[PDB]
Nucleic acid binder design. Structure first.
Ligand SMILES: [Zn+2]
Ligand SMILES: [Zn+2]
Ligand SMILES: [Zn+2]
Length: 89
DNA sequence: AGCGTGGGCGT
DNA sequence: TACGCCCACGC
């Protein structure tokens, strides 16, 4: 089996290569949200998704456009990616 | 646009 | 086990 770790929840055939993505996954079923924003008290299933959320409060935008003459900055990498693909297109 | 929230992955 | 990235979908 290329993905030995199967989810044993009702009507879920999801499988993974490693054990930790299975645990992360299973927080969908249980609604468990370990991490919490200290600003708006909102809780999140994943710590990385919390840190990006925090930037909605702080206004931090670590991702700059590499295109010349462009000063656009973004909070997440995927936003910069969508922006970069907007230039080349 | 701005961002919630998934999987895949390196370390 | 953990953190922190990329990438992606879908409003
Ligand atoms: Zn499952
Ligand atoms: Zn918040
Ligand atoms: Zn740009």
């Amino acid at each position: 089996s290329e993905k030995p770790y199967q989810c044993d929840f009702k009507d879920c055939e999801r499988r993974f290569s490693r054990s930790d993505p299975l645990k992360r996954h299973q927080r969908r079923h249980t609604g468990v949200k370990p991490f919490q924003c200290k600003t708006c008290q909102r809780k999140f299933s994943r710590s990385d998704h919390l840190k990006t959320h925090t930037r909605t409060h702080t206004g931090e935008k670590p991702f700059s456009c590499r295109w010349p003459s462009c000063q656009k900055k973004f909070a997440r990498s995927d936003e910069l990616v969508r922006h970069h693909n907007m230039h080349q297109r």
